[PDB]
Design a protein around this nucleic acid. Structure first.
Ligand SMILES: Nc1ncnc2c1ncn2[C@@H]1O[C@H](COP(=O)(O)OP(=O)(O)OP(O)(O)=S)[C@@H](O)[C@H]1O
Ligand SMILES: Nc1ncnc2c1ncn2[C@@H]1O[C@H](COP(=O)(O)OP(=O)(O)OP(O)(O)=S)[C@@H](O)[C@H]1O
Ligand SMILES: [Mg+2]
Ligand SMILES: [Mg+2]
Lengths: 94, 450, 455
DNA sequence: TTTTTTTTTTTTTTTTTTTTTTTTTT
DNA sequence: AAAAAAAAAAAAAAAAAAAAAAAAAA
């Protein structure tokens, strides 16, 4: 039951991608560019950052993301619409 | 396919949640997650308020020994003990306020809603200055906003008038009549909802008979008939025998359906009830035989009956006339492959940290399945159960077995976890509700997957 | 440098462990892991039996509300509630038995070993048939096997014979003298060890005044002098009580001065204050004195004093003659930027599930760090602490603060958890101990982290 | 129709009694 | 090896306070 999840690495990679892109990024593109090891435990961290930094979280419209786990199969996630950017959360401790 | 399942729950000015809020619940079970000190317990207290006649708030934090918060604290939204001074900076809403709650059930087309509106008038805070009104409806076009608008237009006169000016709603200003109507609707037992409230934070068992005599079983004592017979100056015993036979008949079927689950790698549980005889019955039989052989000896029999009807709070006389007290309960562990008893037990005394939790969970879910369907007609009309701080003192396999046990009986469940055990949850769950708090205000987000 | 630390611990026929077993503990913190119901709590109980005068077995299971085991059960090694029959199949060792445990502490160029031997003689289970003998060693050639060898070829006389010819060995047949010698050796307050046992499983705070009036502070009541003066057939009693109160206040000032460096939630720390309240029978006694000064009626004072002395377990007597019951205690939170109260608390009622744990752990470790040697200046001579079911209810963030504060106070710790958490422990500890059960036997394995990683 | 008065129930807190174990003396 | 004094923990009972529901008066 080792390894599990590494929070610091995920935060650093998210920050690097955000500063590289330079434009607002929704959850779908962020997941597509940086696929997660675990489908859950990842969306939760991103939503926590979005709510903490103060970015509005729209809930009237939906975005669809399709993923495949290690043992084949398929999963369809009905995530809400969130727009992340580097400027808003560039100076908040974690 | 005739069971009501929770689907939604709404809030307004409750606890730390200011303004309108919502949350959705999947038919396959959900799981609320969030950091420490976020607001998970508040959301479930809001639900518990609508069901039990005398709730126990914040039960799970202390392990099942005490309660801390009260109703008037939630309405005004107290955050911490504060300090001295006069501004009372630790109270959010001061002066006139208004609050609302709701909850929705759906089985097949049919739909019901539960409600409550509470408000103040001035700057007082005594529990006697808090107006209340309870609602129950089964028609659309009646949402939280409708009630709030009606209340703002007038007062309690405007609210209570909706019944004559509509169809499908029923206001109740007294909580007792409300709960009586609710219990008659679902055909559950007398204390089913109190048991449901207790099951949310109990992680320790002390005696099975206490639970089976206080909550699970109903009251059918023969005090009235005995008093009538005594004052008349015997079918009573046959009546008592019939009532004690029914209990055995129900326990047989309960054991049969519990047999299918493995409490351990190759072992399963079983409930065992035995009969006891007190001295009081012997005296009555002796008096009867003495009277029969005498032919005036009628004075002693009537005196004994009158004494029994007099002190109805002593185990000497209570065990004479109350069929619930003629039995003794305990559990035993039986393994397959040549069924053979291996251990008998009457409580979780002396156990390990993780054994107590699983024993308590098994016993409580069996009791709930009994209570929610008093007779053999089956088809429960209420099918939800909640847990708080789920799997806090156990390992992976124990949690897996608990979840399997819950799924076996046919119950729809929701779990609460301080952001732990995600891998196990993802297999058996198909929704989530994330709560986050910044500053002093909280918020809700919803997800799903397939 | 100059602080003893636990390094090893051995067992023999204790609880479910049959035969001979041992485990090694690193001087930079270790962790104990293993499945549910394997034997983690048994080692802690074996350690606690050697220190406090009246242990509370299996404390952490109930959260700090009830103890549910006894010494004889461990000695004979039961394994459940049984079934009921001719042969008590649920008891491991029946008849004549023998059992020995020992724990060793180490320092820079020194070594001290503690120990105990307990044995039956026939088929009985009364607590008065469990003959006991406690030991304290200083020499390196004393070892558990030596004690068992001596016992098997003799008895109590054989064991006591070791002091006559050997060196650095002192057997005590009575636990009271053993504990007195121990406390004198470590230069430690009178109720520190019971506090250490209590801190293992406590996770709430009903009221901090009880904690300060029962455990941290000493006992310097004045009942005896009052009885002597009463039977002599007075103001000096009051002067004595006032002096005691002043000393208590100075000590509390010292503690709250110490507690500043450690950090609570960011930008905040804690400060402890106490107020003075007078009530009850003090006014009545003063009135009686001033009335008798007018003049007989000398028996009024004698009656009051005798009545107070006789009812030694009532609030009137406590508030009259016990100096530590003339104060009121509460805790406060101070913001670092400037100085201003943010919140004052007298208990832990109404909090969240995870806030109670952090509050309790913080206050308990703060008090314990002072109850040890730095009470009388200098650095602690006994630094170690044991936590059971660590981080059961808190989240990831809170555990970091708990560990950081624990390190800052200057104590070494061991953590006891199931496989629930594996990242923080790997990050902050150095060694692990793995337990396992197969049937009714249990065993121990000791490894460092790299070796397990290589698998 | 709105306000006031009364009764009944539930929970908490303090005090006293009981039992078992340990230590000491003969 | 046996008898006596002392101390710590558990259990039952009495006193008190607060909240809900029904009846009566302006
Ligand atoms: N009556 C109250 N008294 C004091 N603080 C309160 C009260 N009601 C709410 N709060 C505060 O509001 C916060 C909301 O957290 P809760 O919902 O009560 O517990 P929680 O969210 O379950 O945290 P955990 O650790 O997961 S149990 C609490 O942490 C308190 O700080
Ligand atoms: N006095 C006793 N009475 C009954 N069972 C006992 C006793 N002492 C030990 N056991 C058994 O020992 C096992 C539990 O002991 P431990 O393994 O020390 O508990 P544990 O390690 O704390 O388990 P967890 O991790 O806390 S759930 C169970 O099989 C118990 O039945
Ligand atoms: Mg909670
Ligand atoms: Mg344990």
């Amino acid at each position: 039951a080792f390894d599990g999840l590494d929070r610091e690495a995920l935060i650093h990679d998210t920050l690097a991608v955000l500063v590289e892109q330079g434009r607002p990024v929704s959850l779908g593109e962020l997941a597509s560019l940086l696929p997660p090891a675990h489908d859950l435990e990842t969306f939760a961290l991103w939503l926590a950052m979005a709510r903490e930094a103060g970015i509005e979280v729209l809930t009237e419209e939906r975005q669809f993301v399709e993923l495949v786990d290690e043992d084949e199969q398929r999963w369809g996630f009905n995530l809400p619409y969130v727009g992340l950017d580097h400027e808003a959360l560039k100076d908040i401790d974690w | 396919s005739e069971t009501f399942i929770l689907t939604s729950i709404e809030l307004y000015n409750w606890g730390g949640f200011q303004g309108y809020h919502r949350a959705e619940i999947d038919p396959s079970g959900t799981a609320v997650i969030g950091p420490t000190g976020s607001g998970k317990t508040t959301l479930v207290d809001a639900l518990m308020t609508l069901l039990c006649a005398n709730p126990r708030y914040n039960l799970a934090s202390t392990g099942g020994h005490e309660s801390d918060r009260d109703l008037v604290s939630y309405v005004r939204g107290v955050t911490g003990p504060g300090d001295g001074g006069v501004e009372q900076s630790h109270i959010a809403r001061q002066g006139k306020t208004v609050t609302a709650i709701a909850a929705t059930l759906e089985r097949d087309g049919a739909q019901v809603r539960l409600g409550a509106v509470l408000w103040f008038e001035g700057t007082s805070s005594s529990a006697s200055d808090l107006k209340k009104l309870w609602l129950l409806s089964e028609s659309p076009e009646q949402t939280l906003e409708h009630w709030l608008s009606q209340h703002h237009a007038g007062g309690m006169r405007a609210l209570r008038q909706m019944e004559k000016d509509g169809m499908g709603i029923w206001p109740y200003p007294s909580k007792k009549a409300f709960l009586a109507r609710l219990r008659d609707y679902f055909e559950v037992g007398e204390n089913a909802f109190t048991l449901l409230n207790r099951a949310a934070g109990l992680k320790q068992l002390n005696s099975i008979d206490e639970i089976f005599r206080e909550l699970v079983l109903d009251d059918r004592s023969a005090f009235e008939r005995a008093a009538e017979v005594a004052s008349s100056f015997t079918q009573l015993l046959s009546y008592i025998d019939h009532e004690v036979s029914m209990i055995e008949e129900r326990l047989d079927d309960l054991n049969s359906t519990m047999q299918r689950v493995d409490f351990q790698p190759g072992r399963y549980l079983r409930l065992v009830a035995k009969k006891v005889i007190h001295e009081s019955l012997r005296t009555l039989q002796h008096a009867q035989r003495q009277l029969n052989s005498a032919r005036k000896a009628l004075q002693a029999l009537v005196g004994l009956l009158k004494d029994a009807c007099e002190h109805s709070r002593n185990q000497g006389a209570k065990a004479l006339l109350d069929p619930r007290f003629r039995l003794e309960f305990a559990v035993s562990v039986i393994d397959r492959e040549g069924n053979n008893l291996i251990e008998t037990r009457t409580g979780s005394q002396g156990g390990s940290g993780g054994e107590k939790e699983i024993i308590a969970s098994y016993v409580l879910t069996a009791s709930l399945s009994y209570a929610l369907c008093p007779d053999g007609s089956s088809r429960p009309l209420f099918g939800t159960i909640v847990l708080d701080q789920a799997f806090s003192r156990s390992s992976h396999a124990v949690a897996g077995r608990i979840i399997a046990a819950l799924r076996e009986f046919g119950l729809h469940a929701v779990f609460i976890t301080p952001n732990k055990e995600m891998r196990l949850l993802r297999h058996h769950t198909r929704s989530a509700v994330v709560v986050h708090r910044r500053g002093v205000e909280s918020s809700l987000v919803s997800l799903s997957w397939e």
